[PDB]
């Protein structure tokens, strides 16, 4: 049995190898353990505070709204430091680590920005730090690549499979399986085998925690919605959390619509996919109708994730949680409207969450509404993929 | 699970142990992976553990990996493996079948539809690599339902309530891991628990490998990598192949005679 | 007359054509006048809080210090809005523009980082604005002009001269001595004809201010010094200002050393040049033995002013600061090290700041003290560089 | 100054204004250079402006600034300027010559030691084109211990205070500009204040304009950048050059005149 519920209604589980379930076990036993130490929140809150830069800011963006009713606030992750939300989670994670009386950390990572956050929050809390990458990343992250090694992280190509996210996935288990004695795998999203999700929601709360009292300052009331993008679904669980109990508060999670969800070209499986068994859970995912897995496509590499974490699944469910998509060409005019009329330069797979809020507020000027987009991210990695882009199209 | 019994039985009779081999279904062709069943048969084997090419398999090693790389590349799906099972099981009626599989793949069509189907074709064993015994409920009870063996692992770490639970819940035989990672004292408390019997996998690669197996109290021992390996060897050479794989397995079944 | 004293000692002043005087003046009154404004106070307070992210953390690095007597801390002005310290005065400077009653901007830009941090003020509070750079520096730093262009600026290739910083200093003030009825000339540093090196030092003080409370709340005391790169001098002068009157603690700035004094191809003017009269400033600077003006080199662009803030000058003459210099490779030695033992990718500029820290450090690893290094900005703009060259090196 | 004094004084018993050029020293070359010279003052120029090549003129448009491109092209230094201007005043007794220069080049080897050098070669005033009448103090001061001409610039939107600052202070010639921005009423005001005489500058590139300035007032205009243009579009051919710049000058003389 478990400390906690490993599921979120059908969603969720442990679908792992039985020799990872003494892994899972001690995990969710020693995040337990940690949630109610005063010592360990006081150590993962002077992190948050004094090197990763929280609170972040709330801004109001007042040009991208003139004309309209819509009243639009930004949660600053992109001011975090790393430059995304990930890094909450990780730093938290880490410690987790060094609880257990580990001394290494084994991570996943696609675009490579968990990989950058993995490296970082381990050359700080002196681990050791190995990462699993696919092959087809790999040569198309360079950047990242460096970044990863100048921090003193080891990283190591994937050729098996599809040479992505899904293989990187797998490669990471495999090492796990067999040295999850002094080793600790720090899973990058709010998905896989509880207890992550759970660990991963709980490391970012703060986000809608913040944003709550934040919006409350300001505004004197709550938002009538929050919306964010979902790839995995970590900065979403992020921002929601602390909301689910406020009724009035809509919840809006924006999945990558690429090309668009008719072309089959996209990273929507929450809404579009089918509920399958892979990567240590129950829950949607883009897969053949023999059931093999598939991979998701996106603009922007940081969506990429193949499913998405469960309790978003079970969200959407019970009607708690609404989820659309947004499309590659949504996501870019986004991503050039905010910076000329705001000054800031989000990372493309934020673009997707305010792409959604600037539809909800376009298709009805009129109506009365106050927004919150969680800005996930900045975009400044993102400039030469958007360069490209208007380039090839005159 | 009747033919793993009848297996058995007739094995201690002669006071012998078990060699089962391991091979990906369609690898490295249709054609080629029936002949090489076929061979691996009348070499020696007393049971058959036989994989469906799947995209994710996170539990094997890079040997296996390119088993079902081979497989996927020859367009072998896990419809085409049900063919071949029928046919494998039509040529040999008492040869026990034990399939290897993934979660995504049972329970994409539905849990229950799938062991329908195993049991329409003739297997009689199913081991979810990807299940633990905490989540095995609904597929344990499926296979039940349509009389297939429901396969347990139980790891070299495994606690008391682990052990009596694997007793309690597997059928067939009880999957005995040699190490951790990936493909590449239990004993007694298993029979003490009356649990089916055991057969050690993972890294069983040589003879005596198979001889300390069943001195050890195991009922067999499962290699897989090393006749993988064979076939990945000898890609360019189909025949050369299988006179290979007829050597290495007459060997490893040599080695469980009493 | 003016308002304000133009000199700090013998340096400083107001050296431009007749014609740019009124503006000088005009300029000077609108700070004085904004300076005694609550309103303004509060919007700039604003601004630099809700949209650029302050204050920002002091983090304290104890992995790099181990084994020695020193404390370190770094002022993480690189996890300002931008990624660097400028952000805080073109945010001032953009509404002073605002009070004059002006809608355009004008700007010059050698990396680009200023270029940027105008560009994205602009975009924010609603100027038109034009920046001019050296073509020899649009087609090196193509990554900051596409983000210019992204926020709406105007980018300007100036090929006159060395096609460099100074040649576009130059042009942006002949465009200024024909338009400041309606443009306002966002001057990028602590130098330049007076008012600005006051200017934009009151506009960067809150890096001190915060950095005092902060240290006094952490260690109950002050720091025995505080470190700071010198390019032109604002990020140095913006962390030194509320520490001059606190005699006990040392005031250190760094310059660019680049291949080293003795080679002659470096960039510190304050301690290796001769004082000139140029952009509108009497300061030292790099120039030839007839008086002509020099560029100031270093692997770090950003820190290529051929001259410095003349508050520099006078505090260094007077001795309340002192000033040195570090070298190409101390500056990515430094810059490696923080990257793998605290997890932060630093700018070559900041590194330099820290470069002298660790020297300081290693030099008496037993000497008990307490310094701040201000982290100016962030080094994600620097990866390519570094690689280039420890590739070069094998 | 004594030589503007005289010319001035001449220039009024004629009832004509001056047409006063400006070129760079050393543009294109050395040699080239003294010829341009000596054809604009055969050509009709009442007085010199000359710039000294500076590496950073802020204060003027792209003709001049291409004009010290290439007569730094042509390793043009201030010491070889000055070796110039002692030969154009050997050649040229009574013509003022007034210097263009930037703050930096005066300061460099002492503000004191360049206004004893522009004695030393004959020059008769220096317009410091980057030092407003706020900075002016030193320069002016040691110009005038060095009988050298300070030259102050009246801008168009000068107020009655800097009016009365450049009538005292200034001496020679009041530069009084046409318009804002870099190279490419007050009248009265000015001489109420017994200021020195005016020569408008900026933009005068036709006769009608050197006529224009006479008729309101001034007593000359200066003409650079239009000069400039000649010599950059006759770069190929000295001869052809030279014959330009003496129509252009004999043109806009022939307009000062009564
Ligand atoms: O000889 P090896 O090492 O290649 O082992 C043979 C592998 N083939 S198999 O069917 O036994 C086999 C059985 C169960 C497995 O996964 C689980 F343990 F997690 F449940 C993996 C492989
Ligand atoms: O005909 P143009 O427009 O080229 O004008 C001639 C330019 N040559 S000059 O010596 O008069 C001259 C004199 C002073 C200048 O700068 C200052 F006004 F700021 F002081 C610039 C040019
Ligand atoms: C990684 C990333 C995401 C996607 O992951 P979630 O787990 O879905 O949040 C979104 N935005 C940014 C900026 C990211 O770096
Ligand atoms: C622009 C810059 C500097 C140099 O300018 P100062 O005015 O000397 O501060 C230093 N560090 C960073 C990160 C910069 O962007
Ligand atoms: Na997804
Ligand atoms: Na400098």
Redesign the pocket.
Same mark, same amino acid.
């Given at each position: 049995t478990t400390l906690l519920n490993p599921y979120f209604g059908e969603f969720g589980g442990m679908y792992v190898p039985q020799i990872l379930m003494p892994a899972l076990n001690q995990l969710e036993e020693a995040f337990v353990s940690a949630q109610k130490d005063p010592e360990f929140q006081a150590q993962f809150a002077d992190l948050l505070k004094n090197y990763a830069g929280r609170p972040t800011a709330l801004t109001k963006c007042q040009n991208i709204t003139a004309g309209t009713r819509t009243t639009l606030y930004l949660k600053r992750?992109?001011l975090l430091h790393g #430059? $995304? /939300?990930?890094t909450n989670q990780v730093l938290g994670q880490a410690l987790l680590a060094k609880r257990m009386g580990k001394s290494e950390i084994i991570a996943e990572t696609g $675009?490579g920005? /968990?990989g950058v956050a993995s490296a970082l929050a381990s050359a700080l809390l002196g681990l050791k730090c190995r990462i699993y990458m696919g092959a087809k990343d790999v040569e198309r992250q360079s950047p990242n690549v460096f970044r990863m090694r100048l921090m003193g992280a080891e990283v190591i190509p994937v050729h098996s499979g599809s040479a992505t996210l899904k293989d990187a996935c797998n490669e990471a288990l495999r090492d796990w399986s067999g040295s999850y004695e002094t080793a600790h795998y720090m899973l #990058?999203? $709010?998905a896989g085998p509880h207890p992550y999700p759970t660990i991963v929601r709980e490391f970012q709360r703060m986000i809608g925690e913040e944003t709550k009292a934040q919006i409350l300052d300001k505004e004197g009331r709550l938002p009538d919605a929050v919306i964010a993008?979902? #790839?995995? #679904? @970590?900065? $979403?669980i992020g921002m929601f959390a602390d909301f689910i109990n406020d009724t009035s508060v809509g919840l809006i999670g924006v999945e990558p619509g690429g090309h668009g969800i008719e072309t089959g070209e996209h990273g929507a499986p929450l809404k579009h996919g089918r509920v399958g068994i892979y990567f240590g859970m129950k829950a949607p995912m883009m897969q053949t109708a023999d059931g093999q897995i598939e991979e998701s496509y996106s603009i922007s590499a940081?969506?990429d994730?193949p499913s998405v974490g469960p309790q978003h699944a079970y969200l959407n469910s019970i009607g708690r949680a609404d989820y659309v998509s947004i499309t590659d060409d949504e996501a870019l005019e986004a991503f050039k409207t905010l910076c000329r009329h705001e000054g800031i330069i989000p990372?493309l797979? @934020?673009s997707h969450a305010l792409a959604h809020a600037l539809k909800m507020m376009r298709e009805q000027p009129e109506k009365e509404q106050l927004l919150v987009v969680n800005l @996930?991210?900045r975009g400044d990695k993102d400039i030469f993929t958007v360069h490209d882009i208007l380039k090839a199209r005159g | 699970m009747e033919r793993y019994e009848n297996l058995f039985a007739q094995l201690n009779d002669r006071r012998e142990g078990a060699f089962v081999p391991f091979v990906t279904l369609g690898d490295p062709g249709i054609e080629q992976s029936l002949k090489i069943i076929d061979t691996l048969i009348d070499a020696g084997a007393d049971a058959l553990e036989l994989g469906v090419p799947f995209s994710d398999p996170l539990a094997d090693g890079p040997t296996i990996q390119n088993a079902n790389l081979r497989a996927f590349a020859a367009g072998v799906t896990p419809a085409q493996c049900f063919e071949m099972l029928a046919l494998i099981r039509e040529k040999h009626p008492t040869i026990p079948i034990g399939l290897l599989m993934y979660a995504n793949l049972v329970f994409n069509n539905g849990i229950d539809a799938f062991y329908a189907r195993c049991e329409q074709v003739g297997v009689d064993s199913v081991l979810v690599a990807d299940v633990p015994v905490e989540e095995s409920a609904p597929f344990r009870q499926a296979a039940l339902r349509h009389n297939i063996a429901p396969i347990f692992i139980c790891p070299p770490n495994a606690d008391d309530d682990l052990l009596r639970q694997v007793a309690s819940y597997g059928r067939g035989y009880t999957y005995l891991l040699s190490r951790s990672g990936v493909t590449g004292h239990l004993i007694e408390k298993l029979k003490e628990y009356h649990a089916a019997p055991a057969l050690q996998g993972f890294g069983i690669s040589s003879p005596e490998q198979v001889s300390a197996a069943v001195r050890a109290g195991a009922a067999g021992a499962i290699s897989g990598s090393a006749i993988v390996k064979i076939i990945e060897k000898n890609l360019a050479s189909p025949k050369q192949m299988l006179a290979e794989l007829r050597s290495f397995v007459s060997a490893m079944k040599a080695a469980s005679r009493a």
């Amino acid at each position: 049995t478990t400390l906690l519920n490993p599921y979120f209604g059908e969603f969720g589980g442990m679908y792992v190898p039985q020799i990872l379930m003494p892994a899972l076990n001690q995990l969710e036993e020693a995040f337990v353990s940690a949630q109610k130490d005063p010592e360990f929140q006081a150590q993962f809150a002077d992190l948050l505070k004094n090197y990763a830069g929280r609170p972040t800011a709330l801004t109001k963006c007042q040009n991208i709204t003139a004309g309209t009713r819509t009243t639009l606030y930004l949660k600053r992750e992109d001011l975090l430091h790393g #430059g $995304a /939300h990930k890094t909450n989670q990780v730093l938290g994670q880490a410690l987790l680590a060094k609880r257990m009386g580990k001394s290494e950390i084994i991570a996943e990572t696609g $675009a490579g920005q /968990h990989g950058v956050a993995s490296a970082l929050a381990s050359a700080l809390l002196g681990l050791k730090c190995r990462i699993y990458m696919g092959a087809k990343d790999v040569e198309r992250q360079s950047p990242n690549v460096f970044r990863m090694r100048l921090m003193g992280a080891e990283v190591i190509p994937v050729h098996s499979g599809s040479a992505t996210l899904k293989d990187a996935c797998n490669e990471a288990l495999r090492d796990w399986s067999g040295s999850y004695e002094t080793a600790h795998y720090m899973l #990058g999203t $709010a998905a896989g085998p509880h207890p992550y999700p759970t660990i991963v929601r709980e490391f970012q709360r703060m986000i809608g925690e913040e944003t709550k009292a934040q919006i409350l300052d300001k505004e004197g009331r709550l938002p009538d919605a929050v919306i964010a993008c979902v #790839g995995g #679904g @970590s900065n $979403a669980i992020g921002m929601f959390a602390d909301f689910i109990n406020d009724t009035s508060v809509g919840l809006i999670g924006v999945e990558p619509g690429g090309h668009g969800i008719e072309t089959g070209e996209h990273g929507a499986p929450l809404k579009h996919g089918r509920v399958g068994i892979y990567f240590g859970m129950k829950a949607p995912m883009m897969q053949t109708a023999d059931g093999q897995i598939e991979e998701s496509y996106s603009i922007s590499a940081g969506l990429d994730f193949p499913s998405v974490g469960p309790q978003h699944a079970y969200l959407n469910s019970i009607g708690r949680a609404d989820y659309v998509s947004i499309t590659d060409d949504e996501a870019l005019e986004a991503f050039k409207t905010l910076c000329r009329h705001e000054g800031i330069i989000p990372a493309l797979e @934020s673009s997707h969450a305010l792409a959604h809020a600037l539809k909800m507020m376009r298709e009805q000027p009129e109506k009365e509404q106050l927004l919150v987009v969680n800005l @996930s991210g900045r975009g400044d990695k993102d400039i030469f993929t958007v360069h490209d882009i208007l380039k090839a199209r005159g | 699970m009747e033919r793993y019994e009848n297996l058995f039985a007739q094995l201690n009779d002669r006071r012998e142990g078990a060699f089962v081999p391991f091979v990906t279904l369609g690898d490295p062709g249709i054609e080629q992976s029936l002949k090489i069943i076929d061979t691996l048969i009348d070499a020696g084997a007393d049971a058959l553990e036989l994989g469906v090419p799947f995209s994710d398999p996170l539990a094997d090693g890079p040997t296996i990996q390119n088993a079902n790389l081979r497989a996927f590349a020859a367009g072998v799906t896990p419809a085409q493996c049900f063919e071949m099972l029928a046919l494998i099981r039509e040529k040999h009626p008492t040869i026990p079948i034990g399939l290897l599989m993934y979660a995504n793949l049972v329970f994409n069509n539905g849990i229950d539809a799938f062991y329908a189907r195993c049991e329409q074709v003739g297997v009689d064993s199913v081991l979810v690599a990807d299940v633990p015994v905490e989540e095995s409920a609904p597929f344990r009870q499926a296979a039940l339902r349509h009389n297939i063996a429901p396969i347990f692992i139980c790891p070299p770490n495994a606690d008391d309530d682990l052990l009596r639970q694997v007793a309690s819940y597997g059928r067939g035989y009880t999957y005995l891991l040699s190490r951790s990672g990936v493909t590449g004292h239990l004993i007694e408390k298993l029979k003490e628990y009356h649990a089916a019997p055991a057969l050690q996998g993972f890294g069983i690669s040589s003879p005596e490998q198979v001889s300390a197996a069943v001195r050890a109290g195991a009922a067999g021992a499962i290699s897989g990598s090393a006749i993988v390996k064979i076939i990945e060897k000898n890609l360019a050479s189909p025949k050369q192949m299988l006179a290979e794989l007829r050597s290495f397995v007459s060997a490893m079944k040599a080695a469980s005679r009493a």
